[PDB]
Amino acid sequence: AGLRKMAQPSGVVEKCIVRVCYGNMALNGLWLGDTVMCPRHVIASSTTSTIDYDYALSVLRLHNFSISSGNVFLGVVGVTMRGALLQIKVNQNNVHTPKYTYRTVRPGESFNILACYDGAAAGVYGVNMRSNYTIRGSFINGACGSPGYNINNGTVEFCYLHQLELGSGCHVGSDLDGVMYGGYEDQPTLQVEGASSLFTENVLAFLYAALINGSTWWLSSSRIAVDRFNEWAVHNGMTTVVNTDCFSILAAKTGVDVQRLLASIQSLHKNFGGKQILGYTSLTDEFTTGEVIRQMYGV
Amino acid sequence: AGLRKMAQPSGVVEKCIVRVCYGNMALNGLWLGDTVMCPRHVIASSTTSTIDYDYALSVLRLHNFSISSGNVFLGVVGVTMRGALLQIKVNQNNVHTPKYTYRTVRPGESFNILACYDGAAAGVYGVNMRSNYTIRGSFINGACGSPGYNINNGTVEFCYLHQLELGSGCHVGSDLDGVMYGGYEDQPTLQVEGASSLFTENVLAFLYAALINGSTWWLSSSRIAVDRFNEWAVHNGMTTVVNTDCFSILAAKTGVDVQRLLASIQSLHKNFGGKQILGYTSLTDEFTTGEVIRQMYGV
Ligand SMILES: *[C@H](O)[C@H](C[C@@H]1CCNC1=O)NC(=O)[C@H](CC(C)C)NC(=O)OCc1ccccc1
Ligand SMILES: *[C@H](O)[C@H](C[C@@H]1CCNC1=O)NC(=O)[C@H](CC(C)C)NC(=O)OCc1ccccc1
Numbered sequence: 001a002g003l004r005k006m007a008q009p010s011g012v013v014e015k016c017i018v019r020v021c022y023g024n025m026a027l028n029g030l031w032l033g034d035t036v037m038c039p040r041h042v043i044a045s046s047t048t049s050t051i052d053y054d055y056a057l058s059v060l061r062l063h064n065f066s067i068s069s070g071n072v073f074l075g076v077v078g079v080t081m082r083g084a085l086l087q088i089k090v091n092q093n094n095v096h097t098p099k100y101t102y103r104t105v106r107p108g109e110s111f112n113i114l115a116c117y118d119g120a121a122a123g124v125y126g127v128n129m130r131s132n133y134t135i136r137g138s139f140i141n142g143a144c145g146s147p148g149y150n151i152n153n154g155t156v157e158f159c160y161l162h163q164l165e166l167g168s169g170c171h172v173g174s175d176l177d178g179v180m181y182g183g184y185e186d187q188p189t190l191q192v193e194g195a196s197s198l199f200t201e202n203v204l205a206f207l208y209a210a211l212i213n214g215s216t217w218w219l220s221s222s223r224i225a226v227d228r229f230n231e232w233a234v235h236n237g238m239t240t241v242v243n244t245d246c247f248s249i250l251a252a253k254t255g256v257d258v259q260r261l262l263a264s265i266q267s268l269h270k271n272f273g274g275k276q277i278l279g280y281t282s283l284t285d286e287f288t289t290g291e292v293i294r295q296m297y298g299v
Numbered sequence: 300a301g302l303r304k305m306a307q308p309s310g311v312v313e314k315c316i317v318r319v320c321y322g323n324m325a326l327n328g329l330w331l332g333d334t335v336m337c338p339r340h341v342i343a344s345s346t347t348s349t350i351d352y353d354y355a356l357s358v359l360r361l362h363n364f365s366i367s368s369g370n371v372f373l374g375v376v377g378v379t380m381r382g383a384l385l386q387i388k389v390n391q392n393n394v395h396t397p398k399y400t401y402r403t404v405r406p407g408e409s410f411n412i413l414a415c416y417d418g419a420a421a422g423v424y425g426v427n428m429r430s431n432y433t434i435r436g437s438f439i440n441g442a443c444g445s446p447g448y449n450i451n452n453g454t455v456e457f458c459y460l461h462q463l464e465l466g467s468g469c470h471v472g473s474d475l476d477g478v479m480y481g482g483y484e485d486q487p488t489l490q491v492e493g494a495s496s497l498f499t500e501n502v503l504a505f506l507y508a509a510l511i512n513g514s515t516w517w518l519s520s521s522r523i524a525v526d527r528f529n530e531w532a533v534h535n536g537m538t539t540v541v542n543t544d545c546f547s548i549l550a551a552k553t554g555v556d557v558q559r560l561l562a563s564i565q566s567l568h569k570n571f572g573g574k575q576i577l578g579y580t581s582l583t584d585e586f587t588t589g590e591v592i593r594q595m596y597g598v
Pocket of ligand 1: 027145163187
């Protein structure tokens with residue numbers, strides 16, 4: 001019993017973290033095979049104005065990099081621009097490289113953050129990509145380059161490298177192709193986050209978890225159809241429901257259909273805060289159907 | 300920016316997990332040196348009526364154990380009772396044993412859980428020991444023997460091995476000395492959790508984190524002496540405050556003294572009136588001052 005937001009174990013990723021320094025900047029990189037990937041703002045000069053990154057690369061000198069795995073320093077052979085990342089070729093292969101892939105995550109999907117400082121892992125926690133392509137992380141100065149990952153059947157799927165914090169305190173990365181999530185710029189100029197909405201398909205998963213754990217006080221007797229709910233959602237800070245086949249096994253185990261949970265969601269919006277669900281805010285959207293099925297029933 | 304309940308990286312503990320099977324029982328053990336520690340109910344022939352564990356040990360057949368680290372099987376040399384644990388001497392030293400200590404945690408303290416099934420880590424999350432010596436876990440069948448840990452200066456401090464779930468779904472372990480937290484029994488008979496109170500010093504830490512992250516709408520201009528607050532606390536489900544030295548740094552960073560936060564707690568203890576603080580709709584006691592200082596300022 002219980003429901004907790006968990007991270008997948010971090011050991012296989014920990015041995016891939018390096019410290020990457022250039023000039024006055026220091027952040028983290030991801031060392032796989034004979035390449036280190038890191039946010040390109042490590043080569044930028046200090047300025048609140050816009051950075052011409054092609055110019056910064058044109059004046060770069062390879063001997064000004066300092067890249068280290070612990071107290072072992074890696075020699076730099078070359079550098080390539082990769083979107084908002086640098087691909088740095090080094091003279092040593094990481095013998096602890098796991099089997100890995102890259103994958104760009106989509107809104108509402110969960111993954112794991114390995115928060116790193118000075119080229120070493122400090123903390124690990126699960127996150128969920130919001131509708132405005134930000135995550136609700138915890139990062140302070142020095143965290144850039146911290147990776148996000150999922151572990152799928154022995155292969156590490158890398159999906160995020162940390163890049164910046166917005167004025168609201170939420171967090172933005174790029175994928176490992178160098179594409180910034182949400183299209184935000186890797187620039188120091190002021191940008192404000194897009195509007196954020198609760199991810200309704202994840203709220204549905206959370207409410208099924210609550211039923212399985214014996215929480216029913218919030219359950220409506222009424223029903224509302226998916227498309228009518230979706231019309232209400234986009235005026236009330238919630239995302240539309242697109243996928244429902246994923247709920248079939250949860251509806252079968254609990255005896256409760258999606259239309260009943262959608263009506264419950266509308267009512268919870270009306271006395272919002274009056275009571276928690278399993279000790280959480282009643283409209284919690286950080287859990288996916290997959291995470292719930294794993295925690296309730298196993299892998 | 301941000302505040303997240305996070306775990307310390309799990310890599311050094313993952314290499315210590317083994318699968319321990321006996322008869323119809325399957326759980327997890329902790330392999331350090333040439334010893335495997337696991338909950339002694341692995342040798343119980345029921346978990347349904349009161350168990351004479353000394354008898355169970357006296358009729359044990361060493362060969363009926365199956366202990367494995369991945370696909371490496373460990374030979375059992377002998378078995379000793381250690382409180383609510385078995386101390387199993389095995390024929391191989393774990394070469395990946397980290398530097399480690401044991402320590403029994405106290406109410407209000409945080410640590411990390413590595414949830415394990417079939418002798419392998421599946422998830423990691425942070426917890427905080429309640430005043431009734433239970434934790435807010437997520438565990439299903441097969442999780443017993445999952446360890447709790449902290450890491451300090453590269454030394455692993457083991458403080459918990461998972462033992463049982465109480466009727467309400469909260470979770471109980473033993474320390475690595477074999478002493479059950481809270482004096483609960485490692486017996487299948489009926490047990491109910493004791494009364495629980497919110498840990499006020501942790502609620503204070505959370506409100507300081509909220510201030511550092513720009514959440515101030517709830518902050519009282521009024522204040523209340525620690526004396527007066529403690530009279531209210533014991534009739535309102537909260538612990539008394541005696542240590543305020545742990546807030547000196549946070550009060551200096553924010554300019555807000557403890558007495559104003561105590562008045563705010565009184566106002567917020569019933570509800571947040573429909574608003575949120577760092578995403579919460581009710582007070583949380585899961586964060587210590589140490590976690591908050593680390594996440595806001597590093598170390
Ligand atoms: C890389 O370590 C850093 C991570 C930030 C630092 C504070 N919390 C974080 O997550 N990223 C940057 O400093 C980034 C560099 C740009 C060239 C992309 N800029 C940034 O995040 O500053 C925006 C900001 C505004 C207001 C408060 C805090 C940060
Ligand atoms: C060890 O794997 C197991 C972990 C429980 C199982 C369900 N969630 C857990 O944390 N511990 C026990 O099964 C324990 C055995 C002692 C009483 C000897 N008994 C227990 O936890 O209460 C029984 C129970 C079983 C299944 C669900 C809820 C309670």
